[PDB]
Scaffold this active site. Structure first.
Site, PDB file in Angstrom:
ATOM      1  N   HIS A  62      -2.368  -0.363  -3.123  1.00 25.68           N
ATOM      2  CA  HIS A  62      -2.491   1.093  -3.201  1.00 25.68           C
ATOM      3  C   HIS A  62      -1.121   1.633  -3.581  1.00 25.68           C
ATOM      4  O   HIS A  62      -0.106   1.074  -3.177  1.00 25.68           O
ATOM      5  CB  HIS A  62      -2.880   1.716  -1.854  1.00 25.68           C
ATOM      6  CG  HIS A  62      -4.268   1.398  -1.398  1.00 25.68           C
ATOM      7  ND1 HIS A  62      -5.389   1.717  -2.136  1.00 25.68           N
ATOM      8  CD2 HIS A  62      -4.723   0.855  -0.243  1.00 25.68           C
ATOM      9  CE1 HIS A  62      -6.472   1.383  -1.456  1.00 25.68           C
ATOM     10  NE2 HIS A  62      -6.095   0.859  -0.304  1.00 25.68           N
TER      11      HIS A  62
ATOM     12  N   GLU B  60      -9.992   4.174  -4.369  1.00 22.80           N
ATOM     13  CA  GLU B  60      -9.755   3.192  -3.302  1.00 22.80           C
ATOM     14  C   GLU B  60      -9.478   1.825  -3.930  1.00 22.80           C
ATOM     15  O   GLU B  60      -8.847   0.967  -3.322  1.00 22.80           O
ATOM     16  CB  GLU B  60     -10.996   3.101  -2.410  1.00 22.80           C
ATOM     17  CG  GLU B  60     -11.019   1.964  -1.385  1.00 22.80           C
ATOM     18  CD  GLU B  60     -10.166   2.229  -0.158  1.00 22.80           C
ATOM     19  OE1 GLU B  60     -10.383   3.269   0.497  1.00 22.80           O
ATOM     20  OE2 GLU B  60      -9.293   1.391   0.168  1.00 22.80           O
TER      21      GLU B  60
ATOM     22  N   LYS C 158       0.783  -1.229   0.000  1.00 24.14           N
ATOM     23  CA  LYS C 158       0.000   0.000   0.000  1.00 24.14           C
ATOM     24  C   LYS C 158       0.821   1.288   0.000  1.00 24.14           C
ATOM     25  O   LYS C 158       0.528   2.223   0.744  1.00 24.14           O
ATOM     26  CB  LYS C 158      -0.954   0.004   1.202  1.00 24.14           C
ATOM     27  CG  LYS C 158      -2.019  -1.088   1.152  1.00 24.14           C
ATOM     28  CD  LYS C 158      -2.971  -1.011   2.334  1.00 24.14           C
ATOM     29  CE  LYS C 158      -4.089  -2.039   2.204  1.00 24.14           C
ATOM     30  NZ  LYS C 158      -5.064  -1.963   3.332  1.00 24.14           N
TER      31      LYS C 158
HETATM   32  C1  LIG Z   1     -13.648  -1.987   2.050  1.00 26.70           C
HETATM   33  C2  LIG Z   1     -12.889  -2.693   0.983  1.00 26.70           C
HETATM   34  O1  LIG Z   1     -13.187  -2.464  -0.206  1.00 26.70           O
HETATM   35  N1  LIG Z   1     -11.930  -3.552   1.349  1.00 26.70           N
HETATM   36  C3  LIG Z   1     -11.161  -4.301   0.363  1.00 26.70           C
HETATM   37  C4  LIG Z   1     -11.661  -5.746   0.287  1.00 26.70           C
HETATM   38  O2  LIG Z   1     -13.002  -5.769  -0.229  1.00 26.70           O
HETATM   39  C5  LIG Z   1     -14.023  -6.244   0.659  1.00 26.70           C
HETATM   40  O3  LIG Z   1     -13.859  -7.632   0.946  1.00 26.70           O
HETATM   41  C6  LIG Z   1     -14.200  -8.583  -0.083  1.00 26.70           C
HETATM   42  C7  LIG Z   1     -13.517  -9.936  -0.226  1.00 26.70           C
HETATM   43  O4  LIG Z   1     -12.563 -10.194   0.537  1.00 26.70           O
HETATM   44  O5  LIG Z   1     -13.878 -10.708  -1.144  1.00 26.70           O
HETATM   45  C8  LIG Z   1     -15.247  -8.135  -1.109  1.00 26.70           C
HETATM   46  C9  LIG Z   1     -15.866  -6.714  -1.018  1.00 26.70           C
HETATM   47  O6  LIG Z   1     -15.196  -6.095  -2.118  1.00 26.70           O
HETATM   48  C10 LIG Z   1     -15.492  -5.974   0.288  1.00 26.70           C
HETATM   49  O7  LIG Z   1     -16.352  -6.401   1.336  1.00 26.70           O
HETATM   50  C11 LIG Z   1     -10.748  -6.600  -0.612  1.00 26.70           C
HETATM   51  O8  LIG Z   1     -10.895  -6.188  -1.972  1.00 26.70           O
HETATM   52  S1  LIG Z   1     -11.454  -6.938  -3.090  1.00 26.70           S
HETATM   53  O9  LIG Z   1     -12.714  -6.360  -3.450  1.00 26.70           O
HETATM   54  O10 LIG Z   1     -10.491  -6.928  -4.141  1.00 26.70           O
HETATM   55  O11 LIG Z   1     -11.710  -8.299  -2.713  1.00 26.70           O
HETATM   56  C12 LIG Z   1      -9.283  -6.464  -0.170  1.00 26.70           C
HETATM   57  C13 LIG Z   1      -8.312  -7.186  -1.084  1.00 26.70           C
HETATM   58  O12 LIG Z   1      -8.437  -8.596  -0.970  1.00 26.70           O
HETATM   59  O13 LIG Z   1      -8.906  -5.071  -0.181  1.00 26.70           O
HETATM   60  C14 LIG Z   1      -9.680  -4.299   0.750  1.00 26.70           C
HETATM   61  O14 LIG Z   1      -9.203  -2.999   0.738  1.00 26.70           O
END
Ligand SMILES: CC(=O)N[C@@H]1[C@@H](O[C@@H]2O[C@H](C(=O)O)C[C@H](O)[C@H]2O)[C@@H](OS(=O)(=O)O)[C@@H](CO)O[C@H]1O
Length: 481
Positions: free
Chosen positions: A247, A308, A225
């Site tokens: 990030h 984000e 990040k």
């Molecule tokens: C708040 C946020 O976007 N966090 C991301 C995270 O995303 C969340 O978790 C999942 C999941 O683990 O499958 C799905 C939804 O997008 C959300 O609740 C996740 O990003 S992801 O969307 O690429 O999966 C992680 C990376 O694994 O990064 C966080 O910042």
């Protein structure tokens, strides 16, 4: 110096001068609270080590704080911990917290320490905001971690809702020759390593020659990040997750090996957010890919630019090899359904990967797998540039003209890539050579004094009865009542 009790240890460290050597006598140092505030000097570090590495254990409600500079902690084994679960948090200081610059922690073992949530090692900001720089974590083993948060957090900012153009300062740390193998936790429970917090942060950290074997903590093996971090020569063997540029733009991943050699789980992988990256000479051979993310070796994030979930675009993907990947070699729009809704909910503009420079990559497949090489549901002619790639064994999946002549395959020469200030690696020279060496083994990274691999997850994908029990307790108290 020689000390044989916590109290005498505390005393000597308060007296030690630069160049000093504090040796810990064989024994167990329970509930040890090692706070080193004095400083060594350039060329005259203060070394605190076990007289006989392998015979000194830090246990119980323990804690280590390296607050001074030019300090070295070596040959310590952390086990049988008992920190208070209501006193530690993810995103807080690690079991070993480094608050000063120019410090090194080497040849130490961290094995299923306890049930308190925190990283095992962190570089942390002091209360007045000063950021630690030029530290090194090497030849350490991290196994069977059953707590939340990453194994290692390299911080250059404090956690805050964020997004004020401001960003944390470059750190220049190095994490090398470490071993990571930890059980899978539910959700976004903290993975292997985190560097920085948001895209405006600068990292300039080098992560090289590390062996991640069944580093399954969560979806992210490494969640990078911050800007300009370099991942070179790392081996990711049968890891249930992906190495991510989460990030921060302009990150580098060169000559890393992503190997999945059995059918036990879905393995990864690299998931990329952001732009201006350099992804080269990486070798992907995954017997099984991750269903939840889209079943691919390299995932290029679709989304809103510099958000984000920053759109992946404008980057160099060169001299990589995708050999018998049981999934797409490259997925150009993973999680697009969620990303499109995310952008809509936040009034952002949803876009898809473009301006990608794909040069000299090899895509090969000769096993009975069913996936074409690429998936791009938003394909637009000319949005990307393909040169000197070779593809054969299965359909490409997208209308792109690629040579099928393997005998003529040759990595391409890259010479316009600027090096990262603070990291002594010739990026053009390394990329131009192609893929060198091979996957790293335990003997190439283990602490000099340690012969056998601690823990049981790496070799059995199972935790002992006692450890499986503690792991369940940790998971249970962090979930809804
Ligand atoms: C708040 C946020 O976007 N966090 C991301 C995270 O995303 C969340 O978790 C999942 C999941 O683990 O499958 C799905 C939804 O997008 C959300 O609740 C996740 O990003 S992801 O969307 O690429 O999966 C992680 C990376 O694994 O990064 C966080 O910042």
């Amino acid at each position: 110096q020689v000390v044989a009790s916590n109290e005498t240890l505390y005393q000597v460290v308060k007296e030690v001068k630069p160049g000093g050597l504090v040796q810990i006598a064989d024994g167990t140092y329970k509930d040890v609270q090692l706070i080193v505030s004095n400083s060594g000097k350039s060329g005259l570090p203060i070394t605190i080590k076990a007289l006989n590495p392998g015979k000194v254990f830090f246990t119980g409600d323990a804690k280590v704080e390296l607050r001074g500079e030019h300090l070295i902690l070596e040959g310590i084994w952390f086990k049988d911990g008992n920190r208070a679960i209501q006193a530690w948090k993810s995103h807080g200081p690690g079991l070993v917290a480094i608050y000063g610059s120019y410090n090194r922690i080497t040849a130490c073992v961290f094995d299923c320490f306890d049930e308190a949530n925190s990283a095992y090692i962190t570089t942390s900001l002091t209360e007045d905001g000063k950021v630690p720089q030029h530290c090194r974590i090497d030849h350490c083993s991290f196994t069977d971690k059953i707590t939340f948060d990453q194994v290692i957090n390299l911080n250059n900012t404090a956690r805050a809702i964020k997004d004020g153009s401001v960003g944390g300062p470059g750190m220049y740390h190095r994490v090398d020759h470490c071993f990571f193998s930890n059980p899978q936790k539910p959700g976004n429970a903290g993975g292997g390593i985190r560097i920085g917090y948001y895209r405006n942060d600068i990292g300039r950290c080098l992560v090289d020659s590390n062996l991640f074997m069944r580093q399954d903590s969560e979806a992210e093996i490494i969640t990078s990040k911050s800007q300009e971090n370099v991942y070179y020569g790392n081996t990711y063997l049968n890891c249930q997750g992906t190495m991510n540029f989460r990030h921060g733009d302009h990150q580098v991943a060169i000559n890393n090996f992503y190997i999945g050699n059995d059918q036990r789980f879905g393995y990864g992988g690299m998931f990329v957010w952001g732009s201006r990256h350099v992804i080269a000479c990486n070798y992907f051979e995954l017997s099984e890919t991750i269903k939840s993310r889209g079943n691919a070796a390299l995932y290029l994030n679709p989304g809103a630019m510099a958000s984000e979930h920053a759109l992946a675009f404008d980057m160099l993907i060169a001299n990589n090899a995708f050999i018998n990947v049981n999934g797409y070699a490259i997925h150009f729009n993973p999680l697009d359904e969620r990303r499109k809704e995310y952008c809509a909910a936040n009034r952002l503009k949803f876009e898809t990967p473009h301006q990608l420079m794909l040069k000299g990559n090899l895509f090969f497949k000769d096993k009975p797998y069913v996936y074409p090489f690429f998936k791009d549901d938003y394909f637009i002619a000319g949005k990307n540039s393909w040169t000197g790639n070779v593809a054969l064994g299965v359909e490409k999946g997208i209308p792109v003209n690629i040579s099928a002549n393997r005998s003529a395959y040759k990595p391409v020469k890259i010479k316009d890539i600027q090096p990262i200030e603070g990291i002594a690696l010739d990026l053009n020279a390394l990329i131009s050579k192609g893929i060198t060496g091979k996957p790293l083994s335990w003997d190439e990274v283990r602490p000099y004094w340690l012969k056998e691999m601690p823990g049981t997850y790496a070799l059995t994908a199972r935790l002992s009865a006692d450890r499986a029990a503690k792991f369940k307790a940790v998971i249970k108290r962090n979930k809804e009542h």
